[PDB]
Amino acid sequence: WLVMAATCGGGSFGIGKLKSLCKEFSVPKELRDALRVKYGLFGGKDSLE
């Protein structure tokens, strides 16, 4: 796999994930980016006095 790789090898940059079977919610999975930012927009939806 380093031979097919040629000049650049063993250099992971980003890993995408997906569901094998299909059901309920589509689950195209790379929302992890907004997981470290645990509550970016969801905490404050429409709160005003």
Binding site for a second copy (CB under 8 A): 2-4, 6, 16-18, 28-30
In the complex, least distance from residue 42 CB atom to a second copy, rounded to whole angstroms: 24
Q: Which of 37, 15, 18 is nearest to 29 (CA)?
A: 18
Judge contact between 16 and 29, C-beta under 8 A. yes
In the complex, least distance from residue 6 CB atom to a second copy, rounded to whole angstroms: 8
Smaller CB distance to a second copy: residue 26 or 47?
A: 26
In the complex, least distance from residue 43 CB atom to a second copy, rounded to whole angstroms: 28
What does residue 29 show for φ and ψ, rounded to 5 degrees? -105, 95
